[PDB]
Amino acid sequence: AEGDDPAKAAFDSLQASATEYIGYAWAMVVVIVGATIGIKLFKKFTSKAS
Amino acid sequence: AEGDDPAKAAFDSLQASATEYIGYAWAMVVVIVGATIGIKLFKKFTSKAS
Amino acid sequence: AEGDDPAKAAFDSLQASATEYIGYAWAMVVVIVGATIGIKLFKKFTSKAS
Amino acid sequence: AEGDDPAKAAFDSLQASATEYIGYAWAMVVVIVGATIGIKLFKKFTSKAS
Amino acid sequence: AEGDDPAKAAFDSLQASATEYIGYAWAMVVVIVGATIGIKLFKKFTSKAS
Amino acid sequence: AEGDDPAKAAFDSLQASATEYIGYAWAMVVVIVGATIGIKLFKKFTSKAS
Amino acid sequence: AEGDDPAKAAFDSLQASATEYIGYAWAMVVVIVGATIGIKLFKKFTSKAS
Amino acid sequence: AEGDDPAKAAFDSLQASATEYIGYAWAMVVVIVGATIGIKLFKKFTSKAS
Amino acid sequence: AEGDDPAKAAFDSLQASATEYIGYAWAMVVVIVGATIGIKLFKKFTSKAS
Amino acid sequence: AEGDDPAKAAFDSLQASATEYIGYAWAMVVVIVGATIGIKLFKKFTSKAS
Amino acid sequence: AEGDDPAKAAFDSLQASATEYIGYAWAMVVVIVGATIGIKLFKKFTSKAS
Amino acid sequence: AEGDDPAKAAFDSLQASATEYIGYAWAMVVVIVGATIGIKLFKKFTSKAS
Amino acid sequence: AEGDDPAKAAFDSLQASATEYIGYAWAMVVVIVGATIGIKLFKKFTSKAS
Amino acid sequence: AEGDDPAKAAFDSLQASATEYIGYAWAMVVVIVGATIGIKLFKKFTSKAS
Amino acid sequence: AEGDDPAKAAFDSLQASATEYIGYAWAMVVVIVGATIGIKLFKKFTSKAS
Numbered sequence: 001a002e003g004d005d006p007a008k009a010a011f012d013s014l015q016a017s018a019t020e021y022i023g024y025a026w027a028m029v030v031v032i033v034g035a036t037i038g039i040k041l042f043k044k045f046t047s048k049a050s
Numbered sequence: 051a052e053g054d055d056p057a058k059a060a061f062d063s064l065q066a067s068a069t070e071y072i073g074y075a076w077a078m079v080v081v082i083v084g085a086t087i088g089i090k091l092f093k094k095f096t097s098k099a100s
Numbered sequence: 101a102e103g104d105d106p107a108k109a110a111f112d113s114l115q116a117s118a119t120e121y122i123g124y125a126w127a128m129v130v131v132i133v134g135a136t137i138g139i140k141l142f143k144k145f146t147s148k149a150s
Numbered sequence: 151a152e153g154d155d156p157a158k159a160a161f162d163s164l165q166a167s168a169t170e171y172i173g174y175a176w177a178m179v180v181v182i183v184g185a186t187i188g189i190k191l192f193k194k195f196t197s198k199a200s
Numbered sequence: 201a202e203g204d205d206p207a208k209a210a211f212d213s214l215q216a217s218a219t220e221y222i223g224y225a226w227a228m229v230v231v232i233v234g235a236t237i238g239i240k241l242f243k244k245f246t247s248k249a250s
Numbered sequence: 251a252e253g254d255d256p257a258k259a260a261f262d263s264l265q266a267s268a269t270e271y272i273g274y275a276w277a278m279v280v281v282i283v284g285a286t287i288g289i290k291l292f293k294k295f296t297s298k299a300s
Numbered sequence: 301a302e303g304d305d306p307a308k309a310a311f312d313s314l315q316a317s318a319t320e321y322i323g324y325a326w327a328m329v330v331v332i333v334g335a336t337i338g339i340k341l342f343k344k345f346t347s348k349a350s
Numbered sequence: 351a352e353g354d355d356p357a358k359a360a361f362d363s364l365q366a367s368a369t370e371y372i373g374y375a376w377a378m379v380v381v382i383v384g385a386t387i388g389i390k391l392f393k394k395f396t397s398k399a400s
Numbered sequence: 401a402e403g404d405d406p407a408k409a410a411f412d413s414l415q416a417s418a419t420e421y422i423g424y425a426w427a428m429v430v431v432i433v434g435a436t437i438g439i440k441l442f443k444k445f446t447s448k449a450s
Numbered sequence: 451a452e453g454d455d456p457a458k459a460a461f462d463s464l465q466a467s468a469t470e471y472i473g474y475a476w477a478m479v480v481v482i483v484g485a486t487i488g489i490k491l492f493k494k495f496t497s498k499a500s
Numbered sequence: 501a502e503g504d505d506p507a508k509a510a511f512d513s514l515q516a517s518a519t520e521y522i523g524y525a526w527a528m529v530v531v532i533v534g535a536t537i538g539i540k541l542f543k544k545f546t547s548k549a550s
Numbered sequence: 551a552e553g554d555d556p557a558k559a560a561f562d563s564l565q566a567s568a569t570e571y572i573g574y575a576w577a578m579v580v581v582i583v584g585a586t587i588g589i590k591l592f593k594k595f596t597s598k599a600s
Numbered sequence: 601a602e603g604d605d606p607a608k609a610a611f612d613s614l615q616a617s618a619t620e621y622i623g624y625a626w627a628m629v630v631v632i633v634g635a636t637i638g639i640k641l642f643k644k645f646t647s648k649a650s
Numbered sequence: 651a652e653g654d655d656p657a658k659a660a661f662d663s664l665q666a667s668a669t670e671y672i673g674y675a676w677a678m679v680v681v682i683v684g685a686t687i688g689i690k691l692f693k694k695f696t697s698k699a700s
Numbered sequence: 701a702e703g704d705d706p707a708k709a710a711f712d713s714l715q716a717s718a719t720e721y722i723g724y725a726w727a728m729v730v731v732i733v734g735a736t737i738g739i740k741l742f743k744k745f746t747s748k749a750s
Binding site: 191 | 202203204206207210211213214215217218221222224225228229232
Binding site: 201208218225229230236241 | 263267270271274277278281282285288289292293295296299300
């Protein structure tokens with residue numbers, strides 16, 4: 001009880017920290033995919049011209 | 051929820067971007083086809099003369 | 101039982117999230133294909149003229 | 151005998167739990183593949199038009 | 201058995217979905233070809249006149 | 251011997267399961283190709299008319 | 301000598317067991333590849349028609 | 351040796367299967383070309399008349 | 401908090417770095433596509449002449 | 451030295467095995483290409499007739 | 501910063517390299533098209549004579 | 551304090567060492583990608599010619 | 601310092617090795633493309649004759 | 651050095667092999683084009699008669 | 701000094717052993733790639749014919 005309470009809180013802290021890092025992963029990939037959709041659209045135009 | 055929201059928006063952004071690139075493809079081909087109709091009309095005149 | 105329940109729900113959440121992202125993929129491609137049908141129709145006209 | 155019995159049962163419990171999580175994996179992928187068949191069919195139409 | 205059943209059904213669903221998209225491809229092309237027969241018939245008349 | 255027997259059988263089960271999924275892949279593609287032969291035949295008619 | 305003999309034999313047993321599992325892997329993949337050759341042949345026909 | 355033998359045979363099976371699918375491709379095209387020779391002969395008559 | 405702060409910043413740095421590399425990908429492809437439009441236009445002229 | 455010798459030989463065995471599988475790949479494709487040359491020749495005749 | 505600088509430059513190098521290869525593609529096609537205009541002009545003379 | 555100081559410095563040393571190895575990774579890949587852009591440009595020319 | 605020096609050099613060695621293999625890739629493709637330009641030129645002649 | 655030497659040679663072997671296959675492609679097409687020139691010459695005679 | 705000397709030598713032995721195994725990996729892949737260049741050349745011929 002008394003000893004694990006500082007620890008549980010320490011864990012809530014760590015988990016939220018983790019959520020933070022995770023929000024950043026989602027965004028990172030938002031960029032990466034935004035890149036892929038656009039670049040693949042350029043290849044699509046190549047086709048219309050062909 | 052919280053982490054995927056920046057990502058969903060990032061995606062709306064990417065999709066609209068894509069629409070942009072696509073509007074440009076349509077126009078590009080407008081030019082290409084405008085070219086083909088006109089040039090084929092010249093061949094048509096060749097025929098009337100023949 | 102008790103520990104995996106928050107987890108099962110967490111998973112239902114993730115799966116539905118995934119369905120969301122998937123609905124967006126279908127639409128994205130709706131746009132891409134809508135583009136291809138139209139642009140290929142322009143090439144079709146090129147042919148009628150030819 | 152006496153000490154491992156609560157444990158064997160605990161294990162049957164865990165294994166069934168695992169089957170549960172596994173049924174969910176199959177479904178998750180059902181969705182993912184359902185997505186791939188449909189989206190690849192759209193590319194197929196692109197071809198018929200081409 | 202138990203885990204793959206939701207999945208098999210999920211697949212039947214996807215396949216039928218696919219048949220749907222396919223019926224649409226056939227029709228799309230019905231239009232495209234209907235276009236080609238008619239337009240080529242116009243060129244045929246051009247010939248009779250010539 | 252004794253421990254791997256439930257496992258070997260479990261594997262025969264899995265493999266047969268796999269054959270099932272595979273029979274479905276063959277059919278799926280039967281549909282996809284049936285689509286391609288027919289649609290390409292429509293393009294063939296376009297040619298006869300041309 | 302005396303203590304490791306039951307063990308060496310136990311190991312020969314395990315290794316042969318392993319060969320068994322391995323023969324099954326080869327076959328499993330025989331099926332998977334048999335699938336790929338055939339399915340890719342269907343795509344080949346698609347091409348001849350095209 | 352022992353594990354790859356079921357596999358080699360599995361492969362001979364797959365290859366022969368493939369030959370089957372291939373014989374069908376040849377025939378399919380026999381039909382398609384038979385179509386083209388005949389239809390182009392009709393255009394030939396058009397010319398004799400012209 | 402204190403230990404992950406140098407790390408978060410390190411990540412912002414990395415992400416921006418990534419945006420840089422990405423801007424370069426877009427341009428690279430600008431060149432590649434610019435190439436395809438122009439070269440396909442040359443084939444278009446071939447047609448007008450034909 | 452003594453322990454790796456059974457292993458080196460085991461490897462020579464595996465590599466030769468691999469050469470076997472590879473000879474089969476070459477042949478498989480011999481068939482596939484033989485198919486493509488012939489089928490494309492049929493399309494060539496279509497042209498002579500046209 | 502420090503590690504990606506040799507890399508950015510390496511990329512500028514690669515891109516310029518690419519421009520080089522691209523200038524060569526344009527020329528290659530200059531030749532190919534120069535060929536088509538001239539050869540199609542010969543067919544044009546055939547017509548004047550006819 | 552006194553014992554960990556030689557160690558902290560030892561670590562700064564190791565980290566910088568690591569940066570070194572990392573700068574080399576970036577360059578290595580600069581080469582690999584430079585290779586891919588150029589080689590893919592050659593395939594691009596193949597297309598213009600086609 | 602002392603332990604990583606044999607290693608850095610070992611790496612320079614490996615990288616140069618890699619450049620070697622890469623020069624060979626460029627050439628390999630030189631051949632492949634040389635093949636494509638020439639073979640596509642033969643198809644070009646087919647056209648002039650047509 | 652020592653390990654990549656058997657490999658470099660193995661590659662020279664493969665490349666030369668490739669040249670072989672390539673010489674065969676050139677010839678194959680020699681036949682195909684020889685076919686097209688001759689067959690198109692027959693159509694030319696058709697014209698002289700017309 | 702005295703105890704680690706048999707060990708250092710034992711290590712030189714092991715490392716050289718390792719070089720041996722490594723030379724074999726290079727060759728193994730020589731075969732695998734030799735396979736890929738040749739097989740991809742066959743696909744190249746398919747194209748020339750097409």
